[PDB]
Design an enzyme around this catalytic site. Structure first.
Site, PDB file in Angstrom:
ATOM      1  N   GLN E  11      49.332  42.473  27.634  1.00 29.82           N
ATOM      2  CA  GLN E  11      49.949  42.224  29.207  1.00 29.82           C
ATOM      3  C   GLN E  11      50.026  42.520  30.542  1.00 29.82           C
ATOM      4  O   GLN E  11      49.758  41.938  31.069  1.00 29.82           O
ATOM      5  CB  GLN E  11      51.488  43.242  28.798  1.00 29.82           C
ATOM      6  CG  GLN E  11      53.116  42.883  29.261  1.00 29.82           C
ATOM      7  CD  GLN E  11      54.364  42.786  29.565  1.00 29.82           C
ATOM      8  OE1 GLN E  11      54.912  43.356  30.095  1.00 29.82           O
ATOM      9  NE2 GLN E  11      53.724  44.863  29.148  1.00 29.82           N
ATOM     10  N   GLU E  62      51.140  38.674  21.215  1.00 34.08           N
ATOM     11  CA  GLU E  62      52.990  38.148  21.689  1.00 34.08           C
ATOM     12  C   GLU E  62      52.857  37.275  23.211  1.00 34.08           C
ATOM     13  O   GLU E  62      52.551  37.231  23.720  1.00 34.08           O
ATOM     14  CB  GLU E  62      53.533  39.962  21.963  1.00 34.08           C
ATOM     15  CG  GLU E  62      53.268  40.755  23.454  1.00 34.08           C
ATOM     16  CD  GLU E  62      53.862  40.247  24.958  1.00 34.08           C
ATOM     17  OE1 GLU E  62      55.263  39.236  24.194  1.00 34.08           O
ATOM     18  OE2 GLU E  62      53.405  40.124  25.731  1.00 34.08           O
ATOM     19  N   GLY E 135      48.600  48.774  22.651  1.00 32.61           N
ATOM     20  CA  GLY E 135      48.355  48.768  21.128  1.00 32.61           C
ATOM     21  C   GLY E 135      47.183  46.964  21.703  1.00 32.61           C
ATOM     22  O   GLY E 135      45.945  47.039  21.433  1.00 32.61           O
ATOM     23  N   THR E 136      47.372  45.672  21.939  1.00 34.40           N
ATOM     24  CA  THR E 136      46.794  44.717  22.434  1.00 34.40           C
ATOM     25  C   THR E 136      45.408  45.369  22.941  1.00 34.40           C
ATOM     26  O   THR E 136      43.821  44.634  22.527  1.00 34.40           O
ATOM     27  CB  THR E 136      47.546  43.535  22.890  1.00 34.40           C
ATOM     28  OG1 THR E 136      48.529  43.375  21.863  1.00 34.40           O
ATOM     29  CG2 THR E 136      46.930  41.868  22.512  1.00 34.40           C
ATOM     30  N   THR E 170      53.932  55.780  30.251  1.00 32.65           N
ATOM     31  CA  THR E 170      55.308  55.223  29.691  1.00 32.65           C
ATOM     32  C   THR E 170      55.528  54.797  28.163  1.00 32.65           C
ATOM     33  O   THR E 170      56.157  54.417  27.952  1.00 32.65           O
ATOM     34  CB  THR E 170      55.281  53.899  30.072  1.00 32.65           C
ATOM     35  OG1 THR E 170      56.726  53.136  29.926  1.00 32.65           O
ATOM     36  CG2 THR E 170      54.635  52.334  30.134  1.00 32.65           C
ATOM     37  N   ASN E 197      47.748  53.961  37.582  1.00 35.11           N
ATOM     38  CA  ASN E 197      48.984  53.337  37.927  1.00 35.11           C
ATOM     39  C   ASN E 197      49.496  54.017  38.719  1.00 35.11           C
ATOM     40  O   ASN E 197      49.468  53.265  39.998  1.00 35.11           O
ATOM     41  CB  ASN E 197      49.650  52.405  37.105  1.00 35.11           C
ATOM     42  CG  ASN E 197      49.830  51.222  36.465  1.00 35.11           C
ATOM     43  OD1 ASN E 197      49.191  50.170  36.597  1.00 35.11           O
ATOM     44  ND2 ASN E 197      50.889  50.730  35.377  1.00 35.11           N
ATOM     45  N   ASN E 219      49.289  44.467  40.443  1.00 39.58           N
ATOM     46  CA  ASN E 219      47.869  43.577  39.882  1.00 39.58           C
ATOM     47  C   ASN E 219      47.632  43.285  41.575  1.00 39.58           C
ATOM     48  O   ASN E 219      47.032  42.631  41.345  1.00 39.58           O
ATOM     49  CB  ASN E 219      48.854  42.756  39.573  1.00 39.58           C
ATOM     50  CG  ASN E 219      49.671  43.073  38.077  1.00 39.58           C
ATOM     51  OD1 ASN E 219      49.464  44.416  37.839  1.00 39.58           O
ATOM     52  ND2 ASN E 219      50.598  42.465  37.567  1.00 39.58           N
ATOM     53  N   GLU E 245      23.111  43.053  40.576  1.00 37.60           N
ATOM     54  CA  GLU E 245      22.367  43.559  41.445  1.00 37.60           C
ATOM     55  C   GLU E 245      22.691  44.950  42.231  1.00 37.60           C
ATOM     56  O   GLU E 245      22.303  45.646  42.363  1.00 37.60           O
ATOM     57  CB  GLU E 245      23.204  42.590  42.984  1.00 37.60           C
ATOM     58  CG  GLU E 245      21.860  41.501  42.877  1.00 37.60           C
ATOM     59  CD  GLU E 245      20.655  41.490  42.877  1.00 37.60           C
ATOM     60  OE1 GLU E 245      20.008  41.773  43.500  1.00 37.60           O
ATOM     61  OE2 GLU E 245      20.236  40.250  42.302  1.00 37.60           O
TER      62      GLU E 245
HETATM   63  N1  LIG Z   1      48.834  48.215  37.096  1.00 44.59           N
HETATM   64  C1  LIG Z   1      49.424  47.159  35.818  1.00 44.59           C
HETATM   65  N2  LIG Z   1      49.596  48.095  34.400  1.00 44.59           N
HETATM   66  C2  LIG Z   1      50.683  47.670  33.494  1.00 44.59           C
HETATM   67  C3  LIG Z   1      51.074  46.343  34.046  1.00 44.59           C
HETATM   68  N3  LIG Z   1      51.679  45.712  32.109  1.00 44.59           N
HETATM   69  C4  LIG Z   1      51.221  46.808  31.414  1.00 44.59           C
HETATM   70  N4  LIG Z   1      50.589  47.397  31.972  1.00 44.59           N
HETATM   71  C5  LIG Z   1      50.172  48.661  31.319  1.00 44.59           C
HETATM   72  O1  LIG Z   1      50.379  48.640  30.229  1.00 44.59           O
HETATM   73  C6  LIG Z   1      50.386  49.519  30.154  1.00 44.59           C
HETATM   74  C7  LIG Z   1      51.594  50.405  28.754  1.00 44.59           C
HETATM   75  O2  LIG Z   1      50.670  49.474  27.504  1.00 44.59           O
HETATM   76  P1  LIG Z   1      52.095  48.548  26.272  1.00 44.59           P
HETATM   77  O3  LIG Z   1      53.347  48.820  27.008  1.00 44.59           O
HETATM   78  O4  LIG Z   1      51.434  48.594  25.295  1.00 44.59           O
HETATM   79  O5  LIG Z   1      50.745  47.304  27.129  1.00 44.59           O
HETATM   80  P2  LIG Z   1      50.078  46.298  26.770  1.00 44.59           P
HETATM   81  O6  LIG Z   1      48.690  47.443  27.181  1.00 44.59           O
HETATM   82  O7  LIG Z   1      49.433  44.881  27.354  1.00 44.59           O
HETATM   83  O8  LIG Z   1      49.441  46.229  24.998  1.00 44.59           O
HETATM   84  P3  LIG Z   1      50.181  45.493  24.459  1.00 44.59           P
HETATM   85  O9  LIG Z   1      52.034  46.359  23.836  1.00 44.59           O
HETATM   86  O10 LIG Z   1      49.910  45.358  23.409  1.00 44.59           O
HETATM   87  O11 LIG Z   1      51.964  44.629  24.821  1.00 44.59           O
HETATM   88  C8  LIG Z   1      51.120  51.536  30.645  1.00 44.59           C
HETATM   89  O12 LIG Z   1      50.910  52.188  30.823  1.00 44.59           O
HETATM   90  C9  LIG Z   1      50.829  50.287  32.175  1.00 44.59           C
HETATM   91  O13 LIG Z   1      50.047  50.760  32.827  1.00 44.59           O
HETATM   92  C10 LIG Z   1      51.012  45.959  35.261  1.00 44.59           C
HETATM   93  O14 LIG Z   1      51.012  44.685  35.228  1.00 44.59           O
HETATM   94  N5  LIG Z   1      50.070  46.510  36.069  1.00 44.59           N
HETATM   95  N1  LIG Z   2      14.477  41.985  58.650  1.00 45.50           N
HETATM   96  C1  LIG Z   2      15.200  41.721  58.004  1.00 45.50           C
HETATM   97  N2  LIG Z   2      15.201  42.536  57.164  1.00 45.50           N
HETATM   98  C2  LIG Z   2      16.228  41.892  55.952  1.00 45.50           C
HETATM   99  C3  LIG Z   2      16.870  41.001  56.377  1.00 45.50           C
HETATM  100  N3  LIG Z   2      17.482  40.475  55.410  1.00 45.50           N
HETATM  101  C4  LIG Z   2      17.788  41.405  54.573  1.00 45.50           C
HETATM  102  N4  LIG Z   2      16.966  42.229  55.326  1.00 45.50           N
HETATM  103  C5  LIG Z   2      16.549  43.938  53.763  1.00 45.50           C
HETATM  104  O1  LIG Z   2      16.016  44.050  52.790  1.00 45.50           O
HETATM  105  C6  LIG Z   2      17.060  44.526  51.791  1.00 45.50           C
HETATM  106  C7  LIG Z   2      17.344  44.581  50.584  1.00 45.50           C
HETATM  107  O2  LIG Z   2      16.272  43.262  49.561  1.00 45.50           O
HETATM  108  P1  LIG Z   2      16.449  42.284  49.543  1.00 45.50           P
HETATM  109  O3  LIG Z   2      16.066  41.034  50.125  1.00 45.50           O
HETATM  110  O4  LIG Z   2      17.890  42.421  48.531  1.00 45.50           O
HETATM  111  O5  LIG Z   2      15.120  42.201  48.639  1.00 45.50           O
HETATM  112  P2  LIG Z   2      15.227  40.862  46.720  1.00 45.50           P
HETATM  113  O6  LIG Z   2      16.116  41.740  45.972  1.00 45.50           O
HETATM  114  O7  LIG Z   2      13.934  40.786  46.317  1.00 45.50           O
HETATM  115  O8  LIG Z   2      15.082  39.605  47.809  1.00 45.50           O
HETATM  116  C8  LIG Z   2      17.657  45.365  52.761  1.00 45.50           C
HETATM  117  O9  LIG Z   2      17.390  46.879  52.959  1.00 45.50           O
HETATM  118  C9  LIG Z   2      17.511  45.172  54.103  1.00 45.50           C
HETATM  119  O10 LIG Z   2      17.613  45.542  55.166  1.00 45.50           O
HETATM  120  C10 LIG Z   2      16.823  39.752  57.610  1.00 45.50           C
HETATM  121  O11 LIG Z   2      16.790  38.635  58.366  1.00 45.50           O
HETATM  122  N5  LIG Z   2      15.846  40.868  58.452  1.00 45.50           N
HETATM  123 MG   LIG Z   3      51.549  42.506  24.511  1.00 46.11          MG
END
Ligand SMILES: Nc1nc2c(ncn2[C@@H]2O[C@H](COP(=O)(O)OP(=O)(O)OP(=O)(O)O)[C@@H](O)[C@H]2O)c(=O)[nH]1
Ligand SMILES: Nc1nc2c(ncn2[C@@H]2O[C@H](COP(=O)(O)OP(=O)(O)O)[C@@H](O)[C@H]2O)c(=O)[nH]1
Ligand SMILES: [Mg+2]
Ligand SMILES: Nc1nc2c(ncn2[C@@H]2O[C@H](COP(=O)(O)OP(=O)(O)OP(=O)(O)O)[C@@H](O)[C@H]2O)c(=O)[nH]1
Ligand SMILES: Nc1nc2c(ncn2[C@@H]2O[C@H](COP(=O)(O)OP(=O)(O)O)[C@@H](O)[C@H]2O)c(=O)[nH]1
Ligand SMILES: [Mg+2]
Ligand SMILES: [Mg+2]
Lengths: 136, 439, 429, 429, 430
Positions: E11, E62, E135-136, E170, E197, E219, E245
């Site tokens: 859920q 469910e 659970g799920t 909960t 949460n 959410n 990366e």
């Molecule tokens: N952040 C967030 N947490 C949610 C939400 N809905 C359920 N939860 C989390 O679900 C936990 C409770 O678990 P369940 O009631 O068993 O729901 P479930 O995790 O989907 O498991 P099932 O019973 O199988 O549905 C709570 O502690 C919430 O943190 C949501 O919409 N947002």
């Molecule tokens: N001088 C300059 N440096 C750059 C530029 N773009 C990225 N860098 C440098 O390149 C580093 C990242 O390397 P990256 O491009 O990811 O290497 P690669 O993953 O092997 O392609 C960073 O620390 C930047 O400082 C640019 O346009 N000019």
């Molecule tokens: Mg469920």
């Protein structure tokens, strides 16, 4: 009350120059002009919040575009009443202010700026010039 | 850059913070929704709000404040008020039960179960700050929450953040005009935290503000709202030096090292002028010399601390507006010439002037009038011995017959803490006398 | 030849913010950095203060230093702020908090490493570097402690180059800080040791000159900076323009320093006219020298009448007759023999540069190693001793890594400097 | 003349894509494959990197190689992904798993023959190869393991031809995976014998360059690849363009490898300036020289002051005088003889190429052989010893076909390389 | 190409998969009918009619939840087969779900798994969602994992398992089911991720500012974590990482593959608009113990390997800065033999918020999976829970009369004791 306007200064005519985007702020409390350089992503420039402090910029003496540095720094302690400043009359769309040797051209107003112009200067024509907002 | 974390403890702290933050939002052009208007601009859009407001990705400003209170009605009033969208849902910590004017209750029973969350919120604020100057803690030691929980928070901040700036705006209860009965006990107990873990303490006694508003603002009936508005004006005047450009911009530590001569001598005075109504504002030639004289004259401050009864040690004058750097020193020279106030012999300088180009802003319907220039003094003087010398007289008069001590001992506090607090206050008075003694 | 400048603290940064405008006007440079001077002779020695860039822009050889970003922001927002190179704008996240210890040992020392790199880069770019110019204030914390640290580190690595410093020694009348005596006391003893020329400024005297010598109603910090910037540019005139009798920094140093410890000078500028008196006043060398030797024109807050001039220099700007500046100062000597020491004959140094500053007919800058300069140190030491007797404002210094014995050493060294100045005032032949 | 290039892993693929960005910009190659250059100099030696087809299209002599199939799609979808051949896209269905064992023994082993087939086909297409070049990262799975396998096979087939490796060495500050020690330790002992010259690139150093030098607010992997691509395109500048002082790929090896086991090279490029501050700097050979030897300018994370330069080389590009290109090298050797090695005077190879990189006035690539290159080997060996003493993350490698003693052998010859560098760091005459 | 097979046991697995798939459909822009008005090949398979079928098997004992799915919104999306419903629930009986009613369903379960796998040309691995306390999910899940390991050999196996929480549980035989399932989860699971949460309960309570959230919110958060983990192989990013990366960087020893999980910024819309959700801030909130989905203080153990999936506009520069800050932080400590200990994968796809959900629209996010000795305490308490009931043989008759031997309880207890001793050994200093 501050008049906000978008403006651009093109330094591309020189070597290694860009099209700076600036925001103008005309403070009506004492008629000063402040500038903020708009920040664009990955600009590669030192971040300075204020391009120009809140100060009154004197209008250029001649149309040649050369800035007169005698007003700012000169051992002749002269204070003449003929120094006309950049008032609110000059704030126009497409107007090119000669500001410290930079030809900064205004593109767009603000809503308050449009209200100001339509309320006293009678300028009811609105036509912003594109090219004032730096790309995001 | 230049961030400062605001904390508001207790009902008094919360209301003071409400006034301070409405003033700050109005001054930086931040609407109660927290977003600056695009069409309307009051000034340069420079990030001058970074000290008090953090900018999100949507161009929305969030204050760097923590409203901590043990009781929920004021916090809910803020949550349902005009600045509900302004203030963070967090950083606005509300408890479940008030401390009820009990330092022991707010420091041992309910304080410890909320100081953890307070520290968490403070750390959340701090990690967003890159140039944090320190914490401005607004509280009243008279109340149980603002006293005990404030003390606990100050000690935790001192032990966690180390030597970061710590400015406590404390509303001491004047014994002659006071509300609570056990608030002298609370103040005397809180002297420990305000002396050791508070780097700079600012006096904000209530009825000084009251009579100042009564006689100067033409408001025959001042209230908590007006008092909080004046406190917010003072705080904004202090912070404007870092918030905006000026001739002499000063940071927190920059004037703190000038205001604190000795580690235990940091309980300082405060004053503000021109604190004038709209009717009299346009009739007075509000010059820098005039406002300086009104600030320095004994009656115009915000604390029952007559300089005629003591000696000045260090006065820091924050000027806002178009104040010329020569008006200030001319005023200081004429203050030297005027002998109604005396300075201590070992501080010939005695003066710390800082000028800022941003004039103070006025809230709609506020007591203050639209004024071009203003000045606020933070003064460390030896005359601050008398407020302690009468609050401890209050404390001893109650303590001789052990009245109300059973609440404190029941709330988890040992009886010896009262004697320790009395001895600490006596030592503070003794060192004030020693520092004020002629060399 | 060329001179590299450094601005320390808010005071130094905003002094340089106007000095660079003054020199840019003198050399015909707009804030955009391009050259639009109307005289060919302006750009002949433009390399003394500017370096050409790729675009032909002349970037100043200025290094700006402050632990507060706000002053740097204001300098950039200044009309000529865009002239400086951005990498020279080096600043810390937190300010010095007006503390000599913070500016000299912990916050300044961790930042001076990057300052030295910029200084060495400027020196290497310079073809034949002659002098390190510094602009700072002894009253503050970041300008005093960190600037003195810069000077100390630069002295070791350029022992043979001229260390010129322009320190604004503050005054009680314009006393706007309380750790002021501590800062100036802790900076003076180092400025004695590691500075070739230490020409001091006083904002009280600048205010006085603005009030009465200039009759300006509200001359702000802008004008106060403008006077000191004018007299600051006047000292290096012969290194930038040709003259009938040329000179340079060491030319002045050798002729104004009779003994190594006596190198604290007072600045002086002339002519200084009010706005309404420009037309009426007759610009002649006699009027120039009269205003030079008048007490009110000295831009340090002391009265030269109580002192005796050990040796002085007069840097003349503009083209005029040579005996009208030689025999004129001879007349000054003869009718002011009490002004001057007996055993140094003809204290006055005279050197003429043909190009007056823009907008004038003639000008002059005055330098003097007068004995009276000890009055400032005496009052500073008196207030410092008064504030140190009770050890007030000392915990902020001593908890940052400093000690009390070194405060005593600084007091003793200032007393020694004052005694050295007094030794040559009452000496008899 | 022709150099045939290969890219291993996604890191190597992106770096090679930006390298071909730069090369096509230099040679005026349309993304559609046609030639749009405005100068005949670019077209004269275009055959070094490009092969022409029947229709006039120019195809890079590049072999893409990665076990991950996802990033090869991005490489093809890039702005110049249409330029490569489709049969040069050699990829496997499964990824490398960030595993040296998986790359070198299981997944890449069944694919190394396929990639070697096209490498040999391109070799035969080239009339006379200058050599093979590879771009990869030692910290990955397929870039490191099967890339080194390719290097081994290519060395076995072409012993004489020059083997370039551009290996991205990981750093703890950019340690974005967990098996850096294992992967790098298993790759280095192949690189020691299988590579003629190796170029160590450190992501932490690239990020530092972006922090301070370029002043990019949010620089990305694209900007890092641009910075490395500038150097790996300027390393072969003299092959493709004429110069006053030409050099080929074997020049650097012969003039910078004193002993066969010392071929792990330094880094460097110039000019590097922020867009805001680029207008204020005068681009000169002196500025280039002062940037090549700067610690923060070189793009591998090891301070050179702690070590000494076995050799160095500067591949200057642009029209510059022959005076300074070696006078500055002689001066830096003379003024920093301590940072160089006494028993090799003239440590610096110099090469000059006429054509500068597009959009740049003059440039220089700095390639050095320093004794500080063993600090990263110190760090990697320490991490590997810590990981290996507890046998952590070892089952992943040993399940794919490795052995316990292979890690010990890799540790041993890492330590041998370290000792070889260390003893010449302090060797005496 | 780079596809993974989702399996949902019980859920708990059913609701978790329902949330995961309703998130995946919105992420890929697939309407509940299965059609968009090649990045979905990892989860959805295009048919001849252009309609997409998820690569999932909802296996339950469910019919309530499976019938709910069949009558739900995604009835046209989910395959009529590969939606296996039994006839009677496991009822929190590991013996029932593993010995009696699991056998009659597991054959067709493997038939459906094969029907998925032969279609999957490049199967990366299996991702099984279940709760060990049921659970799920315990019994049928363990037996299905057994059969998968026997058949497909060394295919990657990620298991999102809902262990019992220390206090909020909960069932009474839930500890028995968990302990009996530990054997399978340790022997035949490549990586197992703990998702109890009550930790998510507390996280949602103190972060989302919701007084009464429930299983649906739990959410949704689990599905967000799963999507963040799989986004590296689904969407293009700076550092794409597949299952192997990060498995290689996360699992140092064959017996050490039980890993934590945390996600940030988890936040409401009222709270999000006022916060700078920067990389450093989200990393700090992740490493904060209050931001986890499994209660075990890392301060009570040794970090062994942390894998960080960053999503959105995150940049490697900020990732590295956050890594440096985390390393220099002292409150959290790593094992001595793993210096690097940090795997990072960056993806350009920001997380998407389901309409009606409590997650706020965030420009970036990060999910951290940590292998560490700090979670030996969950076993050290579940074993005490198990032995306090096995001391006098409580509820053991239900298991032993169902068809499971008595000695398997002792075998599972000894296996758990070994799984605790090896955690202590790897945490021990060299
Ligand atoms: N952040 C967030 N947490 C949610 C939400 N809905 C359920 N939860 C989390 O679900 C936990 C409770 O678990 P369940 O009631 O068993 O729901 P479930 O995790 O989907 O498991 P099932 O019973 O199988 O549905 C709570 O502690 C919430 O943190 C949501 O919409 N947002
Ligand atoms: N001088 C300059 N440096 C750059 C530029 N773009 C990225 N860098 C440098 O390149 C580093 C990242 O390397 P990256 O491009 O990811 O290497 P690669 O993953 O092997 O392609 C960073 O620390 C930047 O400082 C640019 O346009 N000019
Ligand atoms: Mg469920
Ligand atoms: N300046 C100012 N002081 C206030 C305000 N409200 C309450 N106070 C102070 O609070 C004191 C009474 O303490 P309490 O009634 O206990 O309020 P508290 O200090 O917040 O303490 P708690 O009620 O326990 O939270 C009075 O003496 C006032 O000085 C206010 O709005 N402004
Ligand atoms: N607003 C502003 N303040 C300045 C300027 N120059 C100096 N100051 C301030 O004045 C103080 C020192 O004055 P100073 O420059 O020595 O006066 P001066 O020597 O007469 O030019 C410093 O604390 C600065 O903050 C300026 O140009 N503008
Ligand atoms: Mg209350
Ligand atoms: Mg050649």
């Amino acid at each position: 009350k501050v008049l906000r306007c978008d403006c651009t200064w093109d330094d591309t005519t020189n070597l290694y120059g860009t099209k700076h985007f600036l925001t103008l702020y005309y403070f009506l409390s004492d008629g000063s002009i402040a500038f903020v350089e708009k920040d664009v992503q990955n600009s590669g420039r030192d971040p300075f919040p204020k391009f120009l402090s809140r100060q009154r910029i004197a209008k250029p003496t001649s149309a040649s575009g050369k800035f007169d540095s005698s007003s700012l720094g000169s051992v002749t302690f002269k204070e003449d009443a003929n120094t006309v400043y950049y008032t609110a009359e000059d704030i126009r769309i497409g107007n090119v202010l000669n500001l410290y040797g930079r030809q900064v051209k205004i593109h767009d107003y603000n809503q308050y700026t449009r209200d100001y112009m339509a309320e006293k200067f009678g300028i009811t024509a609105y036509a912003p010039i594109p090219g004032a907002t730096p790309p995001p | 850059m230049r961030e400062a974390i605001c904390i508001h403890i207790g009902q008094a702290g919360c209301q003071v913070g409400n006034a301070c933050w409405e003033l700050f939002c109005l001054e930086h052009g931040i609407q109660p929704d927290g977003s600056m208007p695009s069409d309307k601009c009051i000034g340069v859009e420079d990030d001058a709000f970074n000290t008090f407001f953090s900018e999100t990705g949507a161009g929305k400003h969030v204050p760097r404040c923590l409203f901590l209170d043990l009781e929920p009605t004021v916090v809910d009033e803020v949550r349902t008020g005009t600045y509900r969208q302004l203030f963070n849902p967090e950083q606005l910590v509300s408890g479940k039960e008030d401390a009820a004017n009990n330092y022991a209750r707010g420091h041992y029973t309910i304080g410890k179960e909320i100081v953890d969350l307070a520290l968490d919120r403070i750390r959340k604020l701090a990690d967003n700050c890159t140039g944090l100057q320190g914490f401005m803690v607004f509280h009243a030691v008279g109340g149980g929450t603002g006293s005990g929980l404030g003390a606990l928070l100050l000690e935790r901040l001192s032990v966690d953040y180390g030597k970061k700036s710590k400015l406590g705006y404390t509303v001491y209860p004047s014994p002659q005009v006071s509300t609570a009965v056990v608030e002298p006990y609370n103040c005397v107990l809180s002297t420990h935290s305000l002396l050791e873990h508070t780097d700079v303490a600012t006096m904000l006694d209530n009825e000084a503000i009251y009579d100042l508003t009564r006689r100067s603002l033409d408001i025959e009936r001042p209230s908590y709202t007006n008092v909080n508005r004046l406190i917010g004006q003072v705080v904004s005047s202090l912070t404007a030096s870092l918030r905006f450009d000026g001739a002499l911009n000063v940071d927190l530590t920059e004037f703190q090292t000038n205001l604190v001569p000795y580690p235990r001598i940091h309980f300082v005075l405060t004053s503000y002028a021109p604190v004038v109504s709209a009717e009299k504002a346009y009739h007075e030639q509000l010059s820098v010399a005039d406002i300086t004289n009104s600030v320095f004259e004994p009656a115009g401050m915000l604390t029952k601390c007559d300089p005629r009864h003591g000696k000045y040690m260090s006065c820091c004058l924050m000027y806002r507006g178009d104040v010329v750097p020569k008006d200030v020193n001319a005023a200081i020279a004429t203050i030297k010439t005027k002998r109604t106030i005396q300075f201590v012999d070992w501080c010939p300088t005695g003066f710390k002037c800082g000028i800022n180009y941003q004039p103070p802003t006025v809230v709609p319907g506020g007591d203050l009038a639209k004024v071009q220039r203003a000045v606020c003094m933070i003064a460390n003087s030896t005359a601050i011995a008398e407020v302690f010398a009468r609050i401890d007289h209050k404390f001893d008069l109650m303590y001789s017959k052990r009245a109300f001590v059973h609440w404190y001992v029941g709330e988890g506090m040992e009886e010896g803490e009262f004697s320790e607090a009395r001895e600490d206050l006596a030592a503070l008075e003794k060192d004030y006398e020693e520092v004020g003694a002629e060399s | 030849r060329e001179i590299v400048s450094c601005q320390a603290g808010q005071c130094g940064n905003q002094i340089g913010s106007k000095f660079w405008e003054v020199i840019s006007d003198e050399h015909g440079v707009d804030p955009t950095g391009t050259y639009q001077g109307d005289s060919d002779l302006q750009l002949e020695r433009i390399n003394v203060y500017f370096d050409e860039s790729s675009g032909g822009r002349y970037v100043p050889r200025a290094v700006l230093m402050d632990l507060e970003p706000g002053t740097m922001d204001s300098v950039r927002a200044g009309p000529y702020g865009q002239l400086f190179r951005p990498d020279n704008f080096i600043f810390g996240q937190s300010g010095a908090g007006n503390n000599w210890a913070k500016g000299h040992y912990t916050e300044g020392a961790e930042l001076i490493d990057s300052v030295l790199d910029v200084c060495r880069k400027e020196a290497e770019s310079c073809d034949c570097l002659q002098g390190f110019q510094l602009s700072h204030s002894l009253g503050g914390g970041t300008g005093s402690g960190m600037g003195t640290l810069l000077i100390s580190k630069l002295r070791e690595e350029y022992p043979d180059r001229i260390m010129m410093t322009f320190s604004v020694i503050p005054s009680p009348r314009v006393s706007d800080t309380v750790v002021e005596p501590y800062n100036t006391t802790l900076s003076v003893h180092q400025l004695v040791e590691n500075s070739d020329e230490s020409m001091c400024i006083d904002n009280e005297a600048l205010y006085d000159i603005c009030f009465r010598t200039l009759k300006l109603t509200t001359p702000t910090f802008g004008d106060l900076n403008h006077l000191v910037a004018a007299v600051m540019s006047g000292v290096t005139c012969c290194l930038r323009f040709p003259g009938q009798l040329n000179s340079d920094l060491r030319k002045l140093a050798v002729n104004l320093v009779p003994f190594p410890r006596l190198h604290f000078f007072m600045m002086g500028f002339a002519p200084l006219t009010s706005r309404g008196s420009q037309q009426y006043r007759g610009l002649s060398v006699a009027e120039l020298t009269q205003q030079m030797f008048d007490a009110k024109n000295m831009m340090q807050a002391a009265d030269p009448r109580h002192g005796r001039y050990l040796t002085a220099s007069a840097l003349f700007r503009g083209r005029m007759s040579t005996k009208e500046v030689d025999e004129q100062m001879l007349n000054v000597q003869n009718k002011n023999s009490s002004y001057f020491i007996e055993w140094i004959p003809n204290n006055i140094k005279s050197s003429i540069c043909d190009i007056p500053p823009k907008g004038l007919k003639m000008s002059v800058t005055f330098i003097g190693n007068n004995t009276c300069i000890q009055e400032m140190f005496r009052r500073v030491g008196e207030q410092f001793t008064g504030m140190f007797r009770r050890k007030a404002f000392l915990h902020w210094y001593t908890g940052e890594g400093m000690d009390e014995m070194e405060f005593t050493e600084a007091e003793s060294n200032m007393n020694d400097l004052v005694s050295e100045y007094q030794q040559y005032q009452d000496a008899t032949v």
